[PDB]
RNA sequence: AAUUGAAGAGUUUGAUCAUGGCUCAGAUUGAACGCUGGCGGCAGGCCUAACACAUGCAAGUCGAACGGUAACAGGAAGAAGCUUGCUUCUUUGCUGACGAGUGGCGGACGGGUGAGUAAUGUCUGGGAAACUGCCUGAUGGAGGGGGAUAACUACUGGAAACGGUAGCUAAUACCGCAUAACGUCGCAAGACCAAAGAGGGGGACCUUCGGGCCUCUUGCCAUCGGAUGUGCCCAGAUGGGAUUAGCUAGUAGGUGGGGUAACGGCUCACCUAGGCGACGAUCCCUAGCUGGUCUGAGAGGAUGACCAGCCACACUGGAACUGAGACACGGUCCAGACUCCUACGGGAGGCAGCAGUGGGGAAUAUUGCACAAUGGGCGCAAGCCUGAUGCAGCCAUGCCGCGUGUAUGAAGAAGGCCUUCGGGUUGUAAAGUACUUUCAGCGGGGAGGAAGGGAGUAAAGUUAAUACCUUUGCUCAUUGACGUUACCCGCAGAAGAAGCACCGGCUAACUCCGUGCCAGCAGCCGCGGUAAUACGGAGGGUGCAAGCGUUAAUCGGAAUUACUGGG
RNA sequence: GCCCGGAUAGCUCAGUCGGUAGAGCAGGGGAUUGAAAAUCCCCGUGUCCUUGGUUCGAUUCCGAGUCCGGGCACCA
């Protein structure tokens, strides 16, 4: 189309779909150069003409070779990739966790929405549904989490057992 | 597809046209002689006999009608000519 | 493809000589032969049964130089061919043409004599023949062409392999430097103390 | 399935896909497949000089 | 001359002998994986997603069937640069031939896959109610006319695909009439039905002077044949399950109408009330079948990838057309899902053909070359097409062969390792020395696969004819993708070429050190709790070798499904 | 590509506001035995990703890049 673009060299055409867009890259069905068409190892060199070809949402350019290193690199569009990947499993994930969390919402702190109140200033907390995207997902490590919902401060007497703790 | 021997499609079916349109004749005139036999016009029915005969043994030759399935029609249909009686 | 190793060594495993270092020598002192393959060879072993047939294995594809799977065919030819199917074995890896030309001596070893077929240097009925594994048929008349022939190691080499009790069962002009071939030894007439049904039933396991 | 992971220092964390073959561990009730070591993210083991081909460690020679 | 063929071990116990499962030794593979890696020859290579697919090619051919000639090469004929013969521009099918078009043949072959199928299949052996293009034997005919239509013109719809309308013209296209038969029907008498011309030559003669006419090769029509192919029929065999026992109403049979090349519920109407089923029907699951392959002494057991016969499918479901033959892989029509062009009205497509892409997976290659060889289509032929096929590349994937020096050589070197620290061992291995140089790398040579086919030529056959043409000999020019071939000759130089498993018993082969029920091993027994021959390293060993192991899978041992052969 | 959060000794984790980094659980040693168990006695484990600046104080502040995880565009 009359768009010349620099690639890292050992680069590979799966890389250049991703470069000019992810979805370009992820759905990518294949891609020929110079009127010949060429496989995904195959590396790209001197600034060759390309001819790319493209499907609908499904990507595994390199579900069967991300971590292969087997011809699929530059961590640019992969890094992308897990994103997706992640994106759709943590989505039915969100549900598992959903589940889970609420009941530990309601054994530590107790009530959804008071623990969510606690939740709403957190990590990088993000909608509710990042919430559960993230623990859902497992990217938050809980525990730590629980003990927060149950931060509250008192010693009224606590402060003698902080002293009995001594004794 | 794209490749000469559509011809052949082209061709074959126009054949599709002629050679259905001659078989129709046949088989009319046929329909005649059994409609022929309803009647009992055993003599006219003979007649129409006498018309298809020509007819059906030239569609035989002509390669549209295997010959011995001819031998078919003018047996069996003479036979009903005669029980006619 | 060939052992190509400290070849005395195998004769201190298998038992005694292997005719690894013919003529000049006899297995002197300097070979360390009896029982000393290793370093706690010079030991005490038993050898269980199975030790046994194996080392009659070993030992005879060992002076052939043969690797087991080749020998392996040659058992199973062995096997189908006629009678005395440890006789027919013997006649086989006997025919050998790098093992006739041993025989004829040209080659002081049956190594030497090996890689002596290997250089196309000796033929058969006036045909070269570079096939190590060449098997000879009976009254064919192994020769030496000239542009490999009279190349000192190999005549004297032949005063060397006349130390030998003899071979008998072909034929040889020896100092003309021309192997010939009568018909497949006898039974009797090889060696006959190296066991061979001890092979036939080690495959037959 | 659960499957033993073979040799010294394996280096696995949790995902990473890797290649499975067979052969019961006769110690381990219920598992049955090895985790073929030194294939794919199974990076072979540390130091084995000697049995290298099971295990996936190349020549010592590097 | 045409099989000479059969191994056991570990493990229950304090110990035994039984019984007996588990496990190992062996061979095997379309294999993958780790590790490693010299060459060649012959083989094999998508087993999973019968998942979807960009590009190219995989089926065209005949001008000796025809109207024609848009290109192209020339001729012939002309305005004419006019070197008056150096050739410019032009008209004409006149020949060599030749786009598009009609038409004959082909496309139903060849090639792929194994989804489906438990029997409409296959194998084996029988049978009668059949057809059969191309080839081929015999018998005869090949008479006489008509209407068209495509291309091509004009106009015109549509973005495209693809048409619409009017006109004109041809033929081995089609239709009729005639003409018939050892052909059809028919008791017979009778009734009735076919087609077509080309190309080469040519004296006499007639030439509406295109030609008739003589001849020749082929083509054409019919019938009876033969061969081949194909459809059909019956019996027997052809997986598992009874925790599937009842199943079926065109179902079983008859009669008659129809129908097919043909018998027949093959299909209808009418009548009978049956038919199948414990020797397993019906239902369910699974599967292409076989010749064969693997294993096994054998009987069996597993499987049926390459190769070969058959069967079925060809994007999914289905129908028919044309033809001798398909209910058609690269044909048609409809539907469906999915891809793509669009001017949104409508259209186009099918790699299970070869290569190639993505994907699935543990995993299987090059969008290579050529028509030279075989075979295939067509054409009389020359020829053209031929991803059939021949070859080539790829990958150790297997089987096979060879090579990675050979002889010699003790100070039994060094260095490494154990030491009962004397020594032993590594180990004649190295070094050195002298030797030969396969195959790699290099330089020149050089088959076979090539038979035919071509032009000329002679004779023979035919014949009115040294014609033409056919058949058969001689002549030169020839015809090789692989292919800088095979193989040989010569070249320099040890030079360019070794790994992997294992060493407690099973089972060939030991010690040192490190670690301490840990880290780790394991097929079974089991090892490791501070002296491990069993874990990790080392040295040395054993095995095997451009392979070695691991795993999967079959069989074997297992006489633990036993018929041979047990209880 | 750009912007922003997460690596706290073996696991889980504690503070992470310029302050001199703490445990839970495990894990090892000791007495015990052939070794454990039970019993009893005793402790530990840090570069706060890495880097360097402001630094008494930085481990959180500062930008850099690492890997983790989110957000949006880039459609040849």
Not at chain 3, 16 to 33: M, Q, Y
Not at chain 4, 31 to 40: E, K, Q
């Amino acid at each position: 189309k009359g768009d010349v673009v620099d690639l890292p060299a050992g680069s590979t055409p799966l890389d250049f779909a991703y470069h000019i867009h992810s979805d370009v890259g992820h759905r990518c069905i294949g891609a020929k150069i110079g009127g010949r068409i060429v496989p995904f190892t195959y590396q790209l060199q001197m600034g060759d003409q390309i001819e790319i070809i493209t499907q609908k949402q499904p990507n595994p350019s390199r579900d069967w070779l991300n971590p292969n290193l087997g011809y699929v690199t530059t961590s640019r569009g992969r890094s992308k990739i897990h994103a997706w990947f992640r994106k759709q499993d943590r989505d039915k994930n969100i549900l598992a966790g959903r589940q889970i969390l609420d009941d530990e919402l309601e054994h530590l702190g107790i009530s959804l929405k008071e623990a969510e109140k606690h939740l709403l200033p957190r990590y990088n907390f993000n909608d509710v549904d990042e919430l559960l995207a993230a623990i859902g997902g497992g990217d938050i490590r809980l525990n730590q989490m629980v003990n927060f919902l149950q931060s509250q401060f008192n010693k009224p007497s606590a402060e003698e057992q902080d002293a009995a703790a001594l004794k | 597809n794209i490749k000469s021997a559509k011809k052949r499609a082209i061709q074959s079916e126009k054949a599709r046209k002629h050679n259905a349109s001659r078989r129709s004749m046949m088989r009319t005139f046929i329909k005649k002689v059994y409609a022929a036999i309803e009647a009992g016009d055993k003599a006219a029915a003979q007649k129409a006999f006498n018309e298809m005969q020509p007819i059906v043994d030239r569609q035989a030759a002509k390669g549209l009608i295997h010959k011995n399935k001819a031998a078919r029609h003018k047996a069996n249909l003479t036979a009903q000519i005669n029980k006619l009686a | 493809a060939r052992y190509l190793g400290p070849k005395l060594k195998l004769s201190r495993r298998e038992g005694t000589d292997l005719f690894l270092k013919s003529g000049v020598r006899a297995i002197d002192t300097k070979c360390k032969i009896e029982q000393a393959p290793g370093q706690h060879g010079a030991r005490k072993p038993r050898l269980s049964d199975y030790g046994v047939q194996l080392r009659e294995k070993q030992k005879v594809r060992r002076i052939y130089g043969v690797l087991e799977r080749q020998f392996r065919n040659y058992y199973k030819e062995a096997a189908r061919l006629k009678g005395n199917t440890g006789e027919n074995l013997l006649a086989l890896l006997e025919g050998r043409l790098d093992n006739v030309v041993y025989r004829m001596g040209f080659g002081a070893t049956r190594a030497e004599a090996r890689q002596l077929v290997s250089h196309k240097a000796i033929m058969v009925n006036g045909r070269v023949v570079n096939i190590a594994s060449y098997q000879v048929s009976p009254n064919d008349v192994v020769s030496i062409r000239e542009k490999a022939k009279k190349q000192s190691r190999v005549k004297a080499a032949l005063e060397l392999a006349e130390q030998r009790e003899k071979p008998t069962w072909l034929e040889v002009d020896a100092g003309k430097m021309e192997g010939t071939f009568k018909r497949k030894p006898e039974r009797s007439d090889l060696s006959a103390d190296i066991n061979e049904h001890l092979i036939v039933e080690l495959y037959s396991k | 399935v659960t499957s033993y992971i073979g040799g010294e220092g394996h280096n696995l964390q949790e995902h990473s896909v890797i290649l499975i073959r067979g052969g019961r561990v006769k110690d381990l009730p219920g598992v049955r497949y090895h985790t073929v070591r030194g294939a794919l993210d199974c990076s072979g083991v540390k130091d084995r000089k000697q049995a290298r081909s099971k295990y996936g460690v190349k020549r010592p020679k590097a």
